[PDB]
Design a protein around this motif. Structure first.
Motif, PDB file in Angstrom:
ATOM      1  N   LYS E  22      -1.517  -5.073   2.247  1.00 22.01           N
ATOM      2  CA  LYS E  22      -1.806  -5.107   0.825  1.00 22.01           C
ATOM      3  C   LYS E  22      -3.040  -4.247   0.452  1.00 22.01           C
ATOM      4  O   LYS E  22      -3.055  -3.529  -0.556  1.00 22.01           O
ATOM      5  CB  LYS E  22      -2.011  -6.535   0.347  1.00 22.01           C
ATOM      6  CG  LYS E  22      -2.422  -6.634  -1.107  1.00 22.01           C
ATOM      7  CD  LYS E  22      -2.599  -8.082  -1.558  1.00 22.01           C
ATOM      8  CE  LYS E  22      -4.020  -8.627  -1.340  1.00 22.01           C
ATOM      9  NZ  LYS E  22      -4.247  -9.854  -2.154  1.00 22.01           N
ATOM     10  N   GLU E  23      -4.105  -4.398   1.228  1.00 21.73           N
ATOM     11  CA  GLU E  23      -5.355  -3.644   0.980  1.00 21.73           C
ATOM     12  C   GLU E  23      -5.117  -2.159   1.152  1.00 21.73           C
ATOM     13  O   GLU E  23      -5.592  -1.342   0.363  1.00 21.73           O
ATOM     14  CB  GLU E  23      -6.483  -4.139   1.877  1.00 21.73           C
ATOM     15  CG  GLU E  23      -6.866  -5.572   1.445  1.00 21.73           C
ATOM     16  CD  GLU E  23      -8.000  -6.225   2.155  1.00 21.73           C
ATOM     17  OE1 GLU E  23      -8.769  -5.511   2.778  1.00 21.73           O
ATOM     18  OE2 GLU E  23      -8.126  -7.440   1.978  1.00 21.73           O
ATOM     19  N   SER E  24      -4.372  -1.791   2.184  1.00 21.58           N
ATOM     20  CA  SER E  24      -3.971  -0.404   2.413  1.00 21.58           C
ATOM     21  C   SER E  24      -3.138   0.171   1.280  1.00 21.58           C
ATOM     22  O   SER E  24      -3.358   1.310   0.853  1.00 21.58           O
ATOM     23  CB  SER E  24      -3.241  -0.274   3.766  1.00 21.58           C
ATOM     24  OG  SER E  24      -3.103   1.088   4.005  1.00 21.58           O
ATOM     25  N   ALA E  25      -2.155  -0.595   0.792  1.00 22.09           N
ATOM     26  CA  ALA E  25      -1.347  -0.208  -0.352  1.00 22.09           C
ATOM     27  C   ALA E  25      -2.201   0.099  -1.579  1.00 22.09           C
ATOM     28  O   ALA E  25      -1.977   1.111  -2.253  1.00 22.09           O
ATOM     29  CB  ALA E  25      -0.296  -1.253  -0.685  1.00 22.09           C
ATOM     30  N   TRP E  26      -3.185  -0.768  -1.880  1.00 21.48           N
ATOM     31  CA  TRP E  26      -4.069  -0.526  -3.018  1.00 21.48           C
ATOM     32  C   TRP E  26      -4.819   0.803  -2.851  1.00 21.48           C
ATOM     33  O   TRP E  26      -4.928   1.605  -3.769  1.00 21.48           O
ATOM     34  CB  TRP E  26      -5.026  -1.703  -3.237  1.00 21.48           C
ATOM     35  CG  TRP E  26      -5.999  -1.489  -4.318  1.00 21.48           C
ATOM     36  CD1 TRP E  26      -5.879  -1.912  -5.610  1.00 21.48           C
ATOM     37  CD2 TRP E  26      -7.334  -0.963  -4.196  1.00 21.48           C
ATOM     38  NE1 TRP E  26      -7.024  -1.619  -6.325  1.00 21.48           N
ATOM     39  CE2 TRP E  26      -7.933  -1.034  -5.482  1.00 21.48           C
ATOM     40  CE3 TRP E  26      -8.067  -0.411  -3.134  1.00 21.48           C
ATOM     41  CZ2 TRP E  26      -9.226  -0.541  -5.740  1.00 21.48           C
ATOM     42  CZ3 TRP E  26      -9.361   0.069  -3.388  1.00 21.48           C
ATOM     43  CH2 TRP E  26      -9.939  -0.028  -4.687  1.00 21.48           C
ATOM     44  N   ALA E  27      -5.392   1.021  -1.658  1.00 21.24           N
ATOM     45  CA  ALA E  27      -6.134   2.252  -1.386  1.00 21.24           C
ATOM     46  C   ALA E  27      -5.210   3.506  -1.492  1.00 21.24           C
ATOM     47  O   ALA E  27      -5.621   4.523  -2.010  1.00 21.24           O
ATOM     48  CB  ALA E  27      -6.797   2.183  -0.036  1.00 21.24           C
ATOM     49  N   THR E  28      -3.968   3.396  -1.025  1.00 20.13           N
ATOM     50  CA  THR E  28      -3.006   4.482  -1.120  1.00 20.13           C
ATOM     51  C   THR E  28      -2.669   4.813  -2.588  1.00 20.13           C
ATOM     52  O   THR E  28      -2.574   5.957  -2.975  1.00 20.13           O
ATOM     53  CB  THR E  28      -1.751   4.186  -0.304  1.00 20.13           C
ATOM     54  OG1 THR E  28      -2.112   3.833   1.015  1.00 20.13           O
ATOM     55  CG2 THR E  28      -0.819   5.425  -0.264  1.00 20.13           C
ATOM     56  N   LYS E  29      -2.527   3.783  -3.422  1.00 17.23           N
ATOM     57  CA  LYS E  29      -2.389   3.985  -4.854  1.00 17.23           C
ATOM     58  C   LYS E  29      -3.584   4.719  -5.460  1.00 17.23           C
ATOM     59  O   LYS E  29      -3.416   5.594  -6.315  1.00 17.23           O
ATOM     60  CB  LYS E  29      -2.174   2.652  -5.571  1.00 17.23           C
ATOM     61  CG  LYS E  29      -0.893   1.967  -5.272  1.00 17.23           C
ATOM     62  CD  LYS E  29      -0.986   0.521  -5.825  1.00 17.23           C
ATOM     63  CE  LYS E  29       0.154  -0.377  -5.438  1.00 17.23           C
ATOM     64  NZ  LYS E  29       0.165  -1.584  -6.291  1.00 17.23           N
ATOM     65  N   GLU E  30      -4.795   4.376  -5.017  1.00 19.18           N
ATOM     66  CA  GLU E  30      -5.989   5.091  -5.479  1.00 19.18           C
ATOM     67  C   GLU E  30      -6.029   6.540  -5.062  1.00 19.18           C
ATOM     68  O   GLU E  30      -6.459   7.409  -5.825  1.00 19.18           O
ATOM     69  CB  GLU E  30      -7.251   4.375  -5.014  1.00 19.18           C
ATOM     70  CG  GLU E  30      -7.419   2.994  -5.640  1.00 19.18           C
ATOM     71  CD  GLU E  30      -8.868   2.566  -5.693  1.00 19.18           C
ATOM     72  OE1 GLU E  30      -9.483   2.471  -4.606  1.00 19.18           O
ATOM     73  OE2 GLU E  30      -9.351   2.381  -6.814  1.00 19.18           O
ATOM     74  N   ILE E  31      -5.553   6.831  -3.853  1.00 21.58           N
ATOM     75  CA  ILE E  31      -5.409   8.209  -3.371  1.00 21.58           C
ATOM     76  C   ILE E  31      -4.440   8.982  -4.266  1.00 21.58           C
ATOM     77  O   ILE E  31      -4.739  10.091  -4.702  1.00 21.58           O
ATOM     78  CB  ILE E  31      -4.962   8.235  -1.891  1.00 21.58           C
ATOM     79  CG1 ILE E  31      -6.097   7.669  -1.007  1.00 21.58           C
ATOM     80  CG2 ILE E  31      -4.638   9.662  -1.465  1.00 21.58           C
ATOM     81  CD1 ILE E  31      -5.677   7.392   0.405  1.00 21.58           C
ATOM     82  N   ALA E  32      -3.280   8.374  -4.557  1.00 20.34           N
ATOM     83  CA  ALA E  32      -2.269   8.998  -5.418  1.00 20.34           C
ATOM     84  C   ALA E  32      -2.886   9.324  -6.802  1.00 20.34           C
ATOM     85  O   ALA E  32      -2.741  10.427  -7.312  1.00 20.34           O
ATOM     86  CB  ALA E  32      -1.062   8.102  -5.574  1.00 20.34           C
ATOM     87  N   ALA E  34      -6.117   9.735  -7.556  1.00 24.75           N
ATOM     88  CA  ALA E  34      -7.101  10.784  -7.412  1.00 24.75           C
ATOM     89  C   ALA E  34      -6.464  12.178  -7.295  1.00 24.75           C
ATOM     90  O   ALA E  34      -6.948  13.147  -7.878  1.00 24.75           O
ATOM     91  CB  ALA E  34      -8.004  10.523  -6.231  1.00 24.75           C
ATOM     92  N   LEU E  35      -5.360  12.277  -6.558  1.00 23.85           N
ATOM     93  CA  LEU E  35      -4.677  13.547  -6.385  1.00 23.85           C
ATOM     94  C   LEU E  35      -3.874  13.986  -7.620  1.00 23.85           C
ATOM     95  O   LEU E  35      -3.639  15.170  -7.799  1.00 23.85           O
ATOM     96  CB  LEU E  35      -3.789  13.529  -5.163  1.00 23.85           C
ATOM     97  CG  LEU E  35      -4.556  13.401  -3.850  1.00 23.85           C
ATOM     98  CD1 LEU E  35      -3.554  13.254  -2.723  1.00 23.85           C
ATOM     99  CD2 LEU E  35      -5.454  14.616  -3.607  1.00 23.85           C
ATOM    100  N   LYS E  36      -3.457  13.034  -8.458  1.00 19.35           N
ATOM    101  CA  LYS E  36      -2.739  13.361  -9.689  1.00 19.35           C
ATOM    102  C   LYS E  36      -3.705  13.940 -10.723  1.00 19.35           C
ATOM    103  O   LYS E  36      -3.282  14.738 -11.549  1.00 19.35           O
ATOM    104  CB  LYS E  36      -2.003  12.160 -10.264  1.00 19.35           C
ATOM    105  CG  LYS E  36      -0.708  11.861  -9.522  1.00 19.35           C
ATOM    106  CD  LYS E  36       0.171  10.837 -10.232  1.00 19.35           C
ATOM    107  CE  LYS E  36      -0.350   9.388 -10.162  1.00 19.35           C
ATOM    108  NZ  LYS E  36       0.610   8.303  -9.810  1.00 19.35           N
TER     109      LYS E  36
END
Lengths: 37, 36, 37, 36, 37, 37
Positions: E22-32, E34-36
């Motif tokens: 779950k924590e990883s998923a949240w961080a991956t969403k933040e990466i997405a 930031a890159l958008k």
């Protein structure tokens, strides 16, 4: 019967997941290598 | 029974997880290809 | 029973993990799309 | 038996998955280090 | 006992893994995100 | 014996996987933080 069958389905799903995890790990290594230069 | 039912729920969750792991792997390969 | 109860807890944790893996997969696809242009 | 055999296959798949997760974690740490 | 105990350990490991996913998923969403942008 | 033993091996593999998933989650958080600025 029902227990054995469910366990076989679990085994199959875990095999598929392991294969995908391996492919993902390799791609992540390639990303690391590309970002290092 | 109760044990069989729990195992069926476990099987279903793992099937869903396997599908998601596959989709993640495909996208990660695309990221690697874009960065190369 | 004790076995049934542990299996219910396993089922619940795996359901939560599957949901999170799906969310992560979607975000990873978005990253791929952003990096492709 | 059939139950024991399925459980042995489950154990083996999970061992392989654990190894791959470890390798992935190391690579992810390298990405973090590269990005700073 | 031995079976129940192993299943309790499995349940605990899966709970920990679900939380981390779950924590990883949240961080991956933040990466997405930031890159958008 | 055989069932209990397989379950112990399953427990051990899942403990190792949970540890690695936690480490991966931390690294993913660091990536998100680096990309946010």
């Amino acid at each position: 019967g029902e227990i054995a069958q469910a366990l076989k389905e679990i085994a199959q799903a875990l095999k598929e997941s392991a294969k995908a995890t391996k492919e993902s790990a390799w791609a992540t290594k390639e990303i690391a290598q590309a970002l290092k230069g």
